[PDB]
């Protein structure tokens, strides 16, 4: 549950460190969670691939708010993080330092499921 204009930490190796959400897609409601794609503005980057002031797409990977499962359980992280994506829908990096959860077992996240180090499933 992240409202618009929230700050996120980048967990890929594309060079970006800090981003801010500036828009949503479709009709997700007043907040977005893990598995949704948003539009972000880069605030702090140290690299040649990306620079501060650009606008990119990203996917939410971790959040501090409870994530509920059909069996009645839920889990929580201690940070909010995302991964930058290209216009074709592929990551801009090749190494993700995050814990992948059940949301990414879906077929559309094959590339993330390959470059991620630790997986919960």
């Amino acid at each position: 549950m992240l409202p618009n204009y929230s700050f996120l930490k980048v967990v890929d190796n594309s060079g970006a460190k800090l981003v801010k959400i500036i828009g949503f897609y479709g009709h997700p409601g007043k907040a977005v969670g893990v598995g949704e794609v948003v539009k972000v503005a880069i605030k702090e980057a140290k690299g040649e691939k990306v620079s501060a002031g650009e606008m990119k797409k990203a996917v939410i990977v971790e959040q501090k708010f409870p994530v509920f499962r059909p069996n009645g359980s839920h889990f929580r992280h201690l940070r909010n993080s995302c991964v930058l994506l290209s216009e074709k829908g592929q990551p801009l990096g090749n190494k993700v330092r995050a814990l992948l959860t059940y949301e990414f077992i879906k077929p559309r996240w094959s590339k993330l499921r390959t470059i991620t180090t630790k997986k919960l499933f």
Partner: protein
């Protein structure tokens, strides 16, 4: 020209307790909450009987669960190994190791929280119903000392010396 009505019979001759499902140390009740109001020796409120009806149903489900599973009596501060099934991933089995930070004893709605830390990703918390069928086994493997709730909360916020196993097994 006279029609005699039918008098119901007594289910348990010379037994004063119907034998409803209750915990061992609770004094036995003298009536069944689902019995019609007309056939009761004591006319107790429907509202109070409905509360007692739910308690009987809860105990019936708990008895069946205990016949299916046998878990240890763990406490807060113990390190546990929990075997679970991931319905999302084609019902595959995994084993999780973590610290128990909260335990609620509320009958059939009992639950607990499991805490663990990873090498780089940080802390991770799970809330697990105790009677959920997805859980297959629970075992105690160790203990972590703490002074009070404030000390335990500080430990959780500052991830440290909680990396028992770096990843999940199976």
């Amino acid at each position: 020209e006279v029609i005699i009505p039918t008098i119901p019979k007594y289910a348990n001759p010379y037994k004063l307790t119907p034998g409803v499902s209750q915990r061992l140390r609770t004094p036995k009740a003298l009536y069944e909450p689902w019995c019609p109001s007309r056939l009761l020796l004591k006319k107790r409120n429907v509202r109070a009987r409905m509360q007692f009806l739910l308690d009987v149903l809860e105990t019936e489900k708990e008895v069946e669960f205990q016949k299916q599973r046998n878990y240890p009596d763990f406490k807060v501060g113990d390190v546990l190994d929990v075997t679970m099934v991931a319905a999302e991933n084609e019902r595959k089995t995994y084993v999780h190791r973590g610290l128990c930070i909260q335990k609620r004893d509320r009958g059939y709605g009992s639950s607990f929280k499991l805490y663990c830390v990873f090498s780089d990703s940080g802390g991770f918390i799970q809330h697990l119903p105790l009677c959920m069928p997805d859980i297959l086994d629970i075992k105690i493997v160790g203990q972590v000392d703490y002074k009070d709730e404030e000390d335990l909360k500080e430990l959780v916020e500052s991830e440290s010396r909680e990396c028992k196993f770096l990843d999940k097994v199976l």
